[PDB]
């Protein structure tokens, strides 16, 4: 023994990958009511008959939602019952003994999914596993109803039978560290880029313009993202729990919506800022004093503070369904749950109103370029590429999420929790992309050359 590295070999972690943990009742690949980790509730297609078995099997009014603790005890019970069924069965007991440790897990995996009676129906394939003809059972098993309905899970178990090693599952652990190091690169980039931008404008006078004051506020929201929002989210995803208590969960949630609102609402202010600085340059310097700009900065952060901390820290943002109420009470749960009122209103204030303003002025910036005092030249495709990046980056980063942010409260269980988080992270990396977009000026280019080399 003495094995406490990552990914020990066991049926527990093998099934945890094929089934996945779900606290609310869901329909499996076939359409059967399932909860927890691959726990078949009932074959009756009425959701109320599923809750009845669940409430009896938990000994509580679950409302169709269990806790992470209860799921782990149904998982072991279902696992500990699959093995009992293997030993009580005449076709399974000899094959189970004849099997080695890793291939025993493959047999338990099938019994976990189809019961003692069902797995004992593979008379020929069990006869092949009896005589240790692995490659021949791998071919035979791949011709069955079981392989047709869940080919991915079958191919993994069939491979576990064939090779006798965890190769079909051990590859899952490379994707954990690969995600982890990518998260680190993201945190480093965001903190590196934006601390450089804030420093360049704070120490240099050639960069203390009005447009750069908005750049400074954008870099401030993006800095807090890499320092506060992203690291805690990385620790959340990797540890698979939340270890900082219930108050800091919402505070982290509050600082998230604070920065993402301030970040996008500042990109909106910059888009309009440059529209005036380009189309009406002389009034743009008469009207927009450095104080008027600072007041516009405060409006973004007051609007953002009101759309993030006020609702959240007052529990207005909260949902009401069962999985939500459990997560608000579970100290180790910090999953995101809202109501329709908040999930909609925030997307308008955070993304959609800024998006529309931005699509308007940038397109108008170019429509007004045509009606000037003047030939298919080359500086117009250069400028058309530039704003394409300004608009293509911001869109591909946040538009997928805020669409999904609206859908996941319109028709529930249409957007997988997994995807809602990925598209949210695809939005977080916009805070790293921003210094590479709005700081390409010769003044900035020099500031960044002197701040690093000299
Ligand atoms: C936890 N991630 C949050 C979830 C929803 C959300 C985000 C950012 C701005 C919003 O206005 C939101 O409604 C995301 O960063
Ligand atoms: Na909580």
Swiss-Prot record:
The modification Phosphotyrosine is found at residue 284. The keyword Nucleus does not apply. Residues 239-249, 318-339, 411-417 are extracellular. GO terms for biological process: adenylate cyclase-activating adrenergic receptor signaling pathway; adenylate cyclase-modulating G protein-coupled receptor signaling pathway; adrenergic receptor signaling pathway; AMPA selective glutamate receptor signaling pathway; bone resorption; brown fat cell differentiation; cell surface receptor signaling pathway; cellular response to amyloid-beta. GO terms for cellular component: apical plasma membrane; ciliary basal body; cilium; clathrin-coated endocytic vesicle membrane; early endosome; endosome; endosome membrane; Golgi apparatus. Palmitoylated. Mainly palmitoylated at Cys-453. Palmitoylation may reduce accessibility of phosphorylation sites by anchoring the receptor to the plasma membrane. Could be depalmitoylated by LYPLA1 at the plasma membrane. Changing residue 222 to N: Affects binding of catecholamines, and produces an uncoupling between the receptor and stimulatory G proteins. Keywords: Cell membrane, Disulfide bond, Endosome, G-protein coupled receptor, Glycoprotein, Golgi apparatus, Hydroxylation, Lipoprotein, Membrane, Palmitate, Phosphoprotein, Receptor, Transducer, Transmembrane, Transmembrane helix, Ubl conjugation. It is a multi-pass membrane protein. Disulfide bonds join 249-334, 327-333. (S)-carazolol binds at residues 256, 346, 424. The chain crosses the membrane at residues 178-201, 215-238, 250-272, 294-317, 340-363, 387-410, 418-441. Changing residue 453 to A: Loss of basal palmitoylation. Its main location: membrane. Residues 202-214, 273-293 are cytoplasmic. Changing residue 453 to G: Uncoupled receptor. (S)-timolol binds at residues 256, 261, 405, 424, 428. One of its GO terms (molecular function) is protein homodimerization activity. Belongs to the G-protein coupled receptor 1 family. Adrenergic receptor subfamily. ADRB2 sub-subfamily. Beta-adrenergic receptors mediate the catecholamine-induced activation of adenylate cyclase through the action of G proteins. The beta-2-adrenergic receptor binds epinephrine with an approximately 30-fold greater affinity than it does norepinephrine. Binds NHERF1 and GPRASP1. Interacts with ARRB1 and ARRB2. Interacts with SRC. Interacts with USP20 and USP33. Interacts with VHL; the interaction, which is increased on hydroxylation of ADRB2, ubiquitinates ADRB2 leading to its degradation. Interacts with EGLN3; the interaction hydroxylates ADRB2 facilitating VHL-E3 ligase-mediated ubiquitination. Interacts (via PDZ-binding motif) with SNX27 (via PDZ domain); the interaction is required when endocytosed to prevent degradation in lysosomes and promote recycling to the plasma membrane. Interacts with CNIH4. Interacts with ARRDC3. This is Beta-2 adrenergic receptor. It comes from Homo sapiens (Human).
């Amino acid at each position: 023994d003495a094995e406490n590295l990552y990914f020990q070999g066991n049926i527990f972690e093998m099934l945890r990958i094929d089934e996945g943990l779900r606290l609310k009742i869901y329909k499996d690949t076939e359409g059967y009511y399932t909860i927890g980790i691959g726990h078949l509730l009932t074959k009756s297609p009425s959701l109320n008959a599923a809750k009845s078995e669940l409430d009896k099997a938990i000994g509580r009014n679950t409302n169709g939602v269990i806790t992470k603790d209860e799921a782990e005890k149904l998982f072991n019970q279902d696992v500990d019952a699959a093995v009992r069924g293997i030993l009580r069965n005449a076709k399974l007991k000899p094959v189970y003994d004849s099997l080695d440790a890793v291939r025993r897990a493959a047999l338990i995996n099938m019994v976990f999914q189809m019961g003692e009676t069902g797995v004992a129906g593979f008379t020929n394939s069990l006869r092949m596993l009896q005589q240790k003809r692995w490659d021949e059972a791998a071919v035979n098993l791949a011709k069955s109803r079981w392989y047709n309905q869940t080919p991915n899970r079958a191919k993994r178990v069939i491979t576990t039978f064939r090779t006798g090693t965890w190769d079909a599952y051990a590859a899952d652990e490379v994707w954990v560290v690969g995600m982890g190091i990518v998260m680190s690169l993201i945190v480093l980039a965001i903190v590196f880029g934006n601390v450089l931008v804030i420093t360049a404008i704070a120490k240099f006078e050639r960069l203390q313009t009005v447009t750069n004051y908005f750049i400074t506020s954008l870099a401030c929201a993006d800095l807090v993202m890499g320092l506060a929002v992203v690291p805690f989210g990385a620790a959340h995803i990797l540890t698979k729990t939340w270890t900082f208590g219930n108050f800091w969960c919402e505070f982290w949630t509050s600082i998230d919506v604070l920065c993402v609102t301030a970040s996008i609402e500042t990109l909106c202010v910059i888009a309009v800022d440059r529209y005036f600085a380009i189309t009406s340059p002389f009034k743009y310097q008469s009207l927009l004093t450095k104080n008027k700009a600072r007041v516009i900065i405060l409006m973004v952060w007051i609007v953002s503070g009101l759309t993030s901390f006020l609702p959240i820290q007052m529990h207005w943002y909260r949902a009401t369904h069962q999985e939500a109420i459990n997560c608000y009470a579970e100290e180790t749960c910090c999953d995101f749950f809202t109501n329709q009122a908040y999930a909609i209103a925030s997307s308008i204030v955070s993304f959609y109103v800024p998006l529309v303003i931005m699509v308007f002025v940038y397109s108008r910036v170019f429509q007004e370029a045509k009606r000037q005092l003047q030939k298919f030249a080359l500086k117009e495709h250069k400028a058309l590429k530039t704003l394409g990046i300004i608009m293509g980056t911001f869109t591909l980063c946040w538009l997928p999420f805020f669409i999904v942010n609206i859908v996941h409260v319109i028709q529930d269980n249409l957007i997988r929790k997994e995807v809602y988080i990925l598209l949210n992270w695809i939005g977080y990396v916009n805070s790293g992309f921003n210094p590479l977009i709005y700081c390409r000026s010769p003044d900035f280019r020099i500031a960044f050359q002197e701040l690093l080399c000299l």
